[model samples]
Each structure stands twice: as structure tokens, then as C-alpha cells.
Target: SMTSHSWLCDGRLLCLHDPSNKNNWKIFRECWKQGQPVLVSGVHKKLKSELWKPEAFSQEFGDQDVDLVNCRNCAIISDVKVRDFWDGFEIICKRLRSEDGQPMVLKLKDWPPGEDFRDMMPTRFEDLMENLPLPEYTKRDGRLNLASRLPSYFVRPDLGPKMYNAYGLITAEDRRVGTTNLHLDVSDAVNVMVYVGIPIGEGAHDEEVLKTIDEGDADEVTKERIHDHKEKPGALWHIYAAKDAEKIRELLRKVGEEQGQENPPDHDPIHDQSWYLDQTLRKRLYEEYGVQGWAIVQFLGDAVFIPAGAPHQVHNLYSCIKVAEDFVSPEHVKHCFRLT
Candidate 1:
């Protein structure tokens, strides 16, 4: 019994070919219809702006303020200048070292703090928005972006009509806990990677570093001191389907109970950012709940499309610059409406 390509349940995480405006987007529309996450290659080049890169932003927006969130608790620890947040990777290895002379698990999450990126830097975002790839699917002003089509209606200030982006930093000691916790969004989104920054002087230990990452060896920190700056693995995403909402809730509840944790009455599991479905948890989820979802690896220049109402999480394998924009498509608008 062969299944048609149109039936997405059978295909796991699908990675499409390098896309152009004509051919690639048509195929993406098919996968998008199935409400599954699809990884598209080579779309980063569409962002024709030079200041979009992380280092370039440090130079241009260096004096600007950004909310620096501590990775451990996800709390806004400080409002720091862009340059202070992103300095030479090698210099940081020494700077972040504590009294113990250990790197102190130097991890930080930085984002535009007080205002929308567009309003905060009006001149830059105006030109930046124009470079979005897959104009028909992701461009804010494109015909398909419901945010633009009905700006008067759906573009509430709270709806986050502005595009979202983030810069992340992590060391070997902090890597495990820095992953994004599971959460569901009410709109379809395409998160595109604009720049990828591996540690400076890293490739010599590339195999050594990632090898220990798999082996669970404690010496993983050894390779951390010896890293490099290169375009390498960026964020890894896990996204569950809208249909699995209930089962996922059960899984979260069961796991929580075992861990001596409990939520309030009628609490929706997807709204809680307390649980991160790591490799072990993901396996346990499938074994106990019979649930499975996409596991995607985004490298430089990749665009990962997520359907509306999908519960998703991200693990940054390397420091990255990414842009996320949400849309309301005809097929997935029901989830948006239901959630709203």
C-alpha cells in the first residue's frame, strides 16, 4: 500500500530542495497544507541586507539597547548595548570566566527590549522587511501575509505584528538547559536563519566537541575552549501537530506527575514553558503516548516553516541570527481563530 506524496502523515520531517520564487514555493504550499514543518534550503540569500548579520549589527547598532535574558531562568537580567552583548568570540571565553576561572556556562539571550524592531529601528527594518524570502508565503507585505492584508483588523499591538528575531550565546556547560521549552503559537510562521556563528577557532575540535556531545562524556568542556567561528549547525526544532494537542497534554501531565510537579486545574499543557522535550523525553513521549513529530536541523541559509497552532521548541546548536514572521493562511486560520 503506497501512500501518495500529498498525504503528509507518512513523511517525517521533509526537507525541500533549494528554492526559487517559481518552483520551490509551489512545493512548499503542498507541505504547508498538511500542517507539517518543512525545511527549505538556500533561502537566506534572499535577505539582501548587509547589516542583517550579527557582527554587522554590532557595528551598526552597537550602542543600541537590547534586553539580555539569562538563559538559566529566562529572566531579563539586563539591558545591554548590542556591542557589549556580542564581542569577539575569543575575548568572551576569558571575559565570562568567573572567580573559579571556569567559563560560568556563559549563556545569554538578547532581543529588542522596549519596542518593536520596526519602530525601534525604523530605517533599518523598513529595508530589511523587503528582503524576506518566499514573498508569497512569508513576506510581510506579500499578498499571503494576513498580517499585512488585514492590518486594520488582526494587527493588534499585542498580536506582535512586528517580525521577531533573537541572538543567542551558550557554552558547553550551559548548552543542555538553554533549549526553548515547548509552547504553541496561534499563527503560522517561517523562521529563517540570517547568520550562523560558531565559536572562533573551533573546527580542530569539531569532531571532538560533537563526539562528546553524543557520548555524554564530562570532558566536553575541553573542546569548548578550543572552538571556532564558522557557519555550522544552528537551531534544531521540534514541532508537534495540532491534532496531537490532547495526547501531548496527557504526556506532559504524566511526566510532570513523575517529576513531582503539578499544574493548576484545567491548565493547558502547551501554554507552560516548564518542560523541554529533549531526546530522552521525546523517546519517552513516543513510547508512552504513541506521539511523534518533526525534528529539524537548521543550518545557515535555511527556512523552517511551522503551521499555525503547532507546539514547537528550539535548541540552538550554535549562536545564530534568525528572523521569524507569522502569517494567517486559509488552511490553518481555523487554529488561529480557535485559539484567539
Candidate 2:
């Protein structure tokens, strides 16, 4: 199958495991300069990970209420006990069901809400935040990180050190299963993945399990678009460069025209976080606009660095937990103003 030829299999991005290596950090800077995504693996080994596991995190904060978002639209559908929600949820998603009588791709959103992340995890937050395998430039007060350098008169922005959780696998009916819909962040950010549960199986009840997912209009040509025939990437990311922001906007608008959005919104399509660029859309973006962005896979203990105004989206391949911190870096601060 021509799936072998898809860009998803190109392996064009760098995957670095050593933080002490100056050369790998150089490559990371280069990727950032071009608004590309780079993966830093082995983050779990570096951080104090015991408290962040599904069981441990649930136990520590289980009594607290949390919001779960529907994966298809990335909207909050319901609230549940943090303990009841994550208990045995790693496999088969036995807790929540939203549509199709199947397990809903409900992602945990904005936990430890409305405060600096450090306040949430009293024991583990220090090492987990300070010892990330990423460069020291991530220091909140670092010269390179503009978030700490705001004018004395202006109120500084507290971007985040936010946490997220989601189940993986995409279905046609729920096209954005455990995925973030496409959007652009005004500030540069780094997301560190701490956990990735094993893929769920239905055994001989494959048919019963399969019905939970979208199987409409299944075909061989369509089968070729699958990204998992090679390795199971815990999280799949599609990130576009800052320069091509307009090209991506035009591409999305064309698709909208075909689907009957005759006029553009005051903000760009990415502004609303309304679309998830599936395989078909990615192919079109390449063929029609020559917009070949990074399609990098983030694994367990992997961290993804996203520069500001670089449009992007993510799909989780399994139940996983991720932590992210936003910063206004000197390099990409220009792109941030463009979106401003």
C-alpha cells in the first residue's frame, strides 16, 4: 500500500533523550527557530514520576471534582469524581459513555484549576517542574523567556504549567477521539508526557468493540491512511510553521467552502478550535498549499516544544497524562503579536 509513502511515516523530526548533550539542544533550537516540533524523550526517568501515575494521581486528588471534555469537540460534557473517573479507565473506558453506546473519549481538562501547577502537587511539583529534561532556558525568569520580562507597568501573564489526560484512537463518527481540535497558541509552550497506558483490546468481542468506533465507509484506500501500521505513537502532533499561518488559514477556508461555510469568520478558522485535520485534510494541505509541517510522535516520557503562533493539534493513542508550561520566548514573540 502507498501508506508507506505518506508523510506520517517520513521520520523527519529529531528525538533526543540526552539533556546534557549540547548538540541535541542545538537541534532543538533550530527546530524552534523554524517553528517545528521536537520530541525530548526519557522525561519520566528525569522527573519524580511516582505521584503522577493514574493510580497515584487519582488517589492524591480523587476526592476533588474535575471536568471531562468530549473528545470529538473538546467541550466539557460532564463532571465526575477524579477517583471514580480514572479508576481502571486505562483499559476499555468502563466509566463514561456519550455517544454510539460505546466508551466516550472523555479527556480530563484543567485539573488543579485556577492556580500555578506547583500548588496542586505539594510533594512532586518541585522536581517535576524544575528538573524537566528541557533546556534551562525554560526558567520562568530566564532572559530568553519573556513571560518573566514583561514591563513593570503591565500586569504579567500567568500562562501555565497545566495538566491534561485523554484516551486515544480516532473514530469517524467522533472524529476527534481523544484529540485536541486544531488551534494556535499565542505563547510558545512545552508539553511533557508522563504516562501512556497500553492499547485497549476487546479480544474475541472485536466486533462488539469495533462498533464503538466509527467504521462508516470503510475501504482499502482509506485503510492506507492509518498511522499505526508501524509504531504506536502515544501522541500524534501536526504542527505548522509560523510563516505558513495564512496558507493554513486559506486551506481551511477552502475546505469550509466545499462544506458550505461560504464566508470567513472574523477570526481565522484555527481561532475557534473547531477543526481536527484528519488524514484526508493533511494530504490536501500538502498537495494544495505545499504546507509540509511536522507530524511528530510523542511517546512516554516525551516532551514536545511548540513555538508561538505555530498552528497545531494532537491525537492521543492511549490513556495518558501530560503537563505543559507556556512561555513568551524572545524568538517567537513576533508571531504572538500577529495573533494579538
Candidate 3:
């Protein structure tokens, strides 16, 4: 029950008082096929393979240092290549090479586990998924009617390999560019994320401003703006708008309260998710729509790499809107943000 972990020097796993070179250490997943780990960037943690194309490719060339892992560990990195289901899933490394044959490489220590990493690490995936939360929402004609259930599951267990790093929102700021909240079934195009702030009322105005003053009424004004927008019910609302709070709360309440055919959402991006999963699109565009040829899955928090043109959707656990305007950045920050 007790193991060792080091935050210094890539978070080494300790088998006893001694640090284990191989991360083949697990604490929870073996008990249940589902296990997830908290993600902390700039911290020393074994990276998730699918999270980075370079890490996946490094398997052939040992580009980065990797420790042996406990076959059934929960928190540490496990050998995904050893998984039985991995063979059927297509390897996306080759699909992401740059125009000049330069492939993006992820430092093995920087990648985070998938949002659903909690579910897949168990050796017994056949066991019914009776507990995990339901997936996001559906982009269909009917109201949401799904929740995490034991009797239900993805029909294609073979497709698990399609995800790089999946599960839910991963964030550090008000906005995360290149982040996604959907599945990327294909690798050619698509970046999907449902609006997540407060909802806009039926006829809210586009204040188009998200100012955070370190000083006076400017701060109060911004707060009020966000509150107003959160309470309203416009199609899509931004968090900075103070007028749409109630409308957004109401929609989230609807999603949060589920039963029978109306199960709570798992925050999946059904539509945008599909776009990422479209293999046809991957072939059409030599590049993907999102950063690193990976569509991001962001719901204001966790993030994962959604492959190119995969069928995807913009999922939401709450109601919000996409700003009608674009917010470009300073040239320097923009360069850093685009560092794929």
C-alpha cells in the first residue's frame, strides 16, 4: 500500500526505501481496470506515451530515459506497448512528421496521462465499467441520455490506441490555445471544445472584453460582466461577460441532473471529436488543425492530444459560449505558443 515517489529528477518510483529504476509500480488500477493520475507540468513525472509523438517513437530509439514499470501500477508510467489491445490501434507517430521530415518530440518526463487513464491501466478491461463518470454530451437530435455505466462501454476496445492523452480538461489559465474537448477520430482536421463559462441569456450582448485589472472598478466591472453573462442563456457565452451567469448555471444543472435515459454527461466532444477522428481528413491535409497535429481536449482543466482528422465533438460539463471574436497574442508569446 505504501510506495515511494520523487518530485526531484523526473519523479522516480521507489519500490522500498530505494528508488526503482523501472516504473512498473502501480497502486490502484490493478484493483479496477480504471486508474488516473494527477497531471503536473514542469514537475518530474513519467510522460504518457500517446501524449507525445516523440515519446511513442522513442520506443524504437530510446530518445529519452525510461524506467521499468510495475505492470499493474496506477500512478507511474506503464508499458503501453506491452498492452494486448495496442496492436489493433494504429500508431500515429508517422502520421505526425513535419513537412521537412522533422517529427515533434515530447520530453518523456513532460507528458501527462490521459483523462481516462484511470480506466485503461487495469489488466482486466473486460470487467464492466460500473463506476466512472458518464462521457460529455452528444451532438444529436435527442437530449443527453448517457452516464458512466457498468453495462455500457466503447464497442471498440481495439480503438483505445487512437487517443494520445484523453479524459478531460487540463488548464492553468483563463484560456488554453490548442486545447480540445473532443475525440479526434481522424488526424487531418478539427479542434473541438464546448463553451464552458456561464451561459448567455437569450439576448446577451457581446461585451468582447476579458480584462483582469490589478486595480479598482476595472476589476469590479470585469467581475460583474462575467456574472451577468454566466446567468443568461445565449447560444454560447464567454466567461468574461457578467450578464450570462444564470443561463449558464441552468444548463449545467440540466446536465448535472440526470436519470434513466437522461444520464449525466461525461463531457465528451461528440461533434468536434468526430472531426479529429476522420482518417479521410488526415489524408487530405498533411497537417492537423490543432497544435502538434493533436487536437486538444480542454474543458478549462485537463488536456489530451486528439489526433488529426478524427471524428470529434466539443463536449461540455457546463454551459458557455465561444467568443465571436478572436484574441491574437503578442508576437513573442505567439511564437512560444506555436512551438510544436
C-alpha RMSD for every candidate: 6.4, 6.2, 22.1
Question: Which residue pairs in model 2 clash with each other?
Answer: none
Q: Clash totals for all models, in order?
A: 8, 0, 112
| TM-score to true structure, per model | 0.78, 0.81, 0.19
> Which residue pairs in model 1 clash with each other?
199-228, 199-229, 200-228, 200-229, 201-227, 201-228, 202-227, 202-228
Name the candidate that leads on TM-score.
2
TM-score rank order? 2, 1, 3
Decoy 2 TM-score against native: 0.81
Candidate 3, residues 38-156: lDDT per residue as tens digits? 11111102222233332333343343233221111112343433221121113323322333663221112212222332253332112112111111111111122111221222211
Where model 2 places Cα greater than 4 Å from the true spot, the runs are 1-12, 22-24, 73-75, 152-159, 170-178, 199-232, 338-340
lDDT of 1: 0.60
The whole-model lDDT of each prediction reads 0.60, 0.66, 0.23
Question: Which numbered prediction scores highest in lDDT against the true structure?
Answer: 2
- Model 2 has an lDDT value of 0.66
Candidate 2 local lDDT, 199-253, one digit each (tens): 4553233232233222221223223433444322367677888788889888888
Looking at candidate 3, what is the lDDT of residue 142?
12
Per-residue lDDT of model 1, residues 1-340, tens digit only: 4221221224555555444545666666777788778776665665565766656666776787655554555656466566765674234353334445643323335355434667666655655466555667666556666654543434321323243333333545444553567888777877777677656533243553353244322122223323552435666567888888778888888777788876664677778676767567778778888887865556777777888778887766666677666767767766644234
